[PDB]
């Protein structure tokens, strides 16, 4: 059950992401992904793949940050999912 290993990895990526996300996005006129608190909620619906479109990126890097949260998140939930199936 080295799943907690992903929980760790992801929660960081969520934070890592939300910090860069705002950094990459600001400066780009019209971006709304420009404050930590929210960017953080973005990073979650993104890593959980729920994507509501309430917020998202428009700058090449913000998008690079995105792609990384998504994956890591898909990866994370995968391992954490697989683990739950074994011990149950």
């Amino acid at each position, epitope marked *: 059950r080295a799943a907690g290993a992903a929980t760790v990895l992801l929660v960081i990526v969520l934070l890592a992401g939300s*910090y860069l996300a705002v*950094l990459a*996005e600001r400066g*780009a*006129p019209g971006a709304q992904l420009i*404050t*930590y*608190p929210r960017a953080l909620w973005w990073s979650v619906e993104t890593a959980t793949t729920v994507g509501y479109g309430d917020l998202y990126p428009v700058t090449l890097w913000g998008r690079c940050v995105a792609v990384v949260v998504m994956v890591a998140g898909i990866t994370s939930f995968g391992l954490v999912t697989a683990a739950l199936a074994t011990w149950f």
Partner: antibody, heavy 118, light 108 residues
Framework: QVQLQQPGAELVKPGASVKLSCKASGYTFTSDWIHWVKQRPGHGLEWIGEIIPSYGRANYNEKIQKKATLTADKSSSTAFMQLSSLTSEDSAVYYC???????????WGAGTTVTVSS | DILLTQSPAILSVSPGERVSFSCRASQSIGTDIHWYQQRTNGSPRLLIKYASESISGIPSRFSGSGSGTDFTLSINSVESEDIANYYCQQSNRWPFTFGSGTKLEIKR
């Protein structure tokens, strides 16, 4: 205690440049952004630009001619705004302000009155 | 960029009367509006954040409301110390922008 300290005034001859300073104290976070706002006498507040000390990146108001260059010294917790090639149009009070990355200016400096004259 | 319209530019009220400052955004900005007070020769001071959130240290007299494109800053029972210029500021989209300001005038 005063969170943001700015010098009272700066006299600059037309065409010359000046470097304004903003010394910050109190809690400091990696998410802090230091903003600069210009206000001409009798007029409103105009956003100039912002900088994130923890990373060093700066953004500027695209709607106005770029007169400023922002930098920050982490060790001295001081932010700087270099204004170059000034004219009387640049005469105004320049405020620095701190934002905790959450959208509002929690605190403002007292402002530096810049006068461009010979 | 988001344009913030503050009209009227001057508001005249009698002592102890309730007053309301208006701020209209060119597009919907949710509740990402903040209000500042600036007295003669003073620096701006945060009064209300995110349209209606109180700031510690500010008199209960001050309150805000609205969402979307229309916002209001209200003062219950105005007094002399409230004489100043009031500005709104948005943080929904980059770059942050300021309204042009409304001056409060008291008719004594």
């Amino acid at each position: 205690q005063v969170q943001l300290q700015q010098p009272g005034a700066e006299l600059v001859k037309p065409g010359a440049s000046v470097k304004l300073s903003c010394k910050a104290s109190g809690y400091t976070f990696t998410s802090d952004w230091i903003h600069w706002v210009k206000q001409r006498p009798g007029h409103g507040l105009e956003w100039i630009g912002e900088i994130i000390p923890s990373y060093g990146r700066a953004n500027y108001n695209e709607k106005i001619q770029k007169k400023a260059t922002l930098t920050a010294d982490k060790s001295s917790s001081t932010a700087f705004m270099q204004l170059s090639s000034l004219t009387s149009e640049d005469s105004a009070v320049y405020y620095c302000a701190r934002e905790r990355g959450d959208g509002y200016f929690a605190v403002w400096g007292a402002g530096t009155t810049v006068t461009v004259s010979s | 960029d988001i344009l913030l319209t503050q009209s009227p530019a001057i508001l005249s009220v009698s002592p102890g009367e309730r007053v309301s400052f208006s701020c209209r955004a060119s597009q919907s900005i949710g509740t990402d509006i903040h209000w500042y007070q600036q007295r003669t020769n003073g620096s701006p001071r945060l009064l209300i954040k995110y349209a209606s959130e109180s700031i510690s240290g500010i008199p209960s007299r001050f309150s805000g409301s609205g969402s979307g494109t229309d916002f209001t800053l209200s003062i219950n029972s105005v007094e002399s110390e409230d004489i100043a210029n009031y500005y709104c500021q948005q943080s929904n989209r980059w770059p942050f922008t300021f309204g042009s300001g409304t001056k409060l005038e008291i008719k004594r």
